[PDB]
C-alpha cells in the first residue's frame, strides 16, 4: 500500500523564500514564516488567505503554534523571537537574548515553554507567561539547527552542524545524552517521533536517520533524496499509513514506507528548494514550502 | 546580512 497525494492548492503570497509551515493543532490553519519578514495565516482546508502578520525587522526562520492554536512564536535573523496572538496578529512579547540569527522554535506540549536554537550556539528555553529566559544551554559548538520537545515536555532534543544531536532534561538543564554514529556530518534537523521513543535525524549526506532513544541506536536510514546544503523539514505522517515525510534539495517532496525504507512517492510542482514539510495532525493533508526561486506554498491532499 | 533574507534560506558553505 502506498500513499496516493495530490496537488490541491498553490499558496501564493509571500515575496521571499518561505522558510517553514505548520499546521495548527486544531487543524484549521496553517502558519508560514518567511525570509519577506511575514508571518501568513491560510484556511487549512481551502487554502485560503486568511492574515499577514507583521513586526520582525528582518527575515524569519522557523515558526510554531502553541498546543491551544492561539499563539505563535516565529525565529528571525534580527536576534529575537516574537510570541503572537493569532486571532489579532499582535505582538504579545519579544523574547531577546539571542546573539545571532534564531533559527529554530517549538513550545513544549503544555505551551508555558518555549525553546529556540540559534546560530549563537545554544539553545534557550523562555517562559511564555513572563517572556524570561529561564536557561541558556552552551548546547553546541556551531550553529544549532533544530529544537524539539518530546511528548510530555520532560526532554527537549537539538541539533547542530557540530555533528550532534543531544536531548537534555527540561528541567535541570543538563544533557542527558549525545547521539552520533562515528561520522560526523552536520546535522541539520531533529524531531521526536509523536510517541516519545525516537528521533529522526537529517544530516547533510543525502540521508535521513530513525534512532532509538532509550538504546541509542540508529535503526532505519532513508535515501534517494538530495540534501547537502540547507536545513530541511521532515516529518512522521501518521493519519493514514506511516510514512517519513522530507523537502528535497531537487524540488520534490520525498515520502518514504517507515518500516520498509522504501520511496512510496515523490511530488512534483515546486520549483526551487523545497525547505519545509508538515503533516496536518488529522487529515492525510501535506503542506510544502519553496525558496525564493518559487516562493510558493502547496497543499497536497491523499486518501491514505 | 543574509542576502536572501533569513538564515534558512541560505546554503551551508
Known amino acids: 500500500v502506498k500513499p496516493n497525494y495530490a496537488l490541491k492548492f498553490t499558496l501564493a503570497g509571500h515575496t521571499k523564500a518561505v522558510s517553514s509551515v505548520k499546521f495548527s493543532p486544531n487543524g484549521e490553519w496553517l502558519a508560514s514564516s518567511s525570509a519577506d519578514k511575514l508571518i501568513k495565516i491560510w484556511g487549512a482546508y481551502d487554502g485560503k488567505f486568511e492574515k499577514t502578520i507583521s513586526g520582525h525587522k528582518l527575515g524569519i526562520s522557523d515558526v510554531a503554534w502553541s498546543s491551544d492554536s492561539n499563539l505563535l512564536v516565529s525565529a528571525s535573523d534580527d536576534k529575537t523571537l516574537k510570541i503572537w496572538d493569532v486571532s489579532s496578529g499582535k505582538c504579545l512579547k519579544t523574547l531577546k537574548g539571542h546573539s545571532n540569527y534564531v533559527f529554530c522554535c517549538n513550545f513544549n506540549p503544555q505551551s508555558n515553554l518555549i525553546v529556540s536554537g540559534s546560530f549563537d550556539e545554544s539553545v534557550r528555553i523562555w517562559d511564555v507567561k513572563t517572556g524570561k529566559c529561564l536557561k541558556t544551554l552552551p548546547a553546541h559548538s556551531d550553529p544549532v539547527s533544530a529544537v524539539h520537545f518530546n511528548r510530555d515536555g520532560s526532554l527537549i532534543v537539538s541539533s547542530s552542524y557540530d555533528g550532534l544531536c543531544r536531548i537534555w532534561d527540561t528541567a535541570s538543564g543538563q544533557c542527558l545524552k549525545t547521539l552520533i554514529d562515528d561520522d560526523n556530518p552536520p546535522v541539520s534537523f531533529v524531531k521526536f517521533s509523536p510517541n516519545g521513543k525516537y528521533i529522526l535525524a537529517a544530516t547533510l549526506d543525502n540521508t535521513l536517520k530513525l534512532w532509538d532513544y532509550s538504546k541509542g541506536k540508529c535503526l532505519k536510514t532513508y535515501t534517494g533524496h538530495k540534501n547537502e546544503k540547507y536545513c530541511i523539514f521532515a516529518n512522521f505522517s501518521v493519519t493514514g499509513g506511516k510514512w517519513i515525510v522530507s523537502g528535497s534539495e531537487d524540488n520534490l517532496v520525498y515520502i518514504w514506507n517507515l518500516q520498509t525504507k522504501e520511496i512510496v512517492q515523490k511530488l512534483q510542482g515546486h520549483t526551487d528548494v523545497v525547505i519545509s514539510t508538515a503533516c496536518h495532525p488529522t487529515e492525510n493533508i501535506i503542506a510544502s514550502a519553496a525558496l525564493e526561486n518559487d516562493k510558493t506554498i502547496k497543499l497536497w491532499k491523499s486518501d491514505c | ?13
Not at chain 2, 546580512?1 to 558553505?13: F, L, Q, V, Y
Open chain 2, 1 to 13: 546580512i543574509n542576502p536572501t533574507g533569513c538564515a534558512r534560506s541560505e546554503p551551508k558553505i
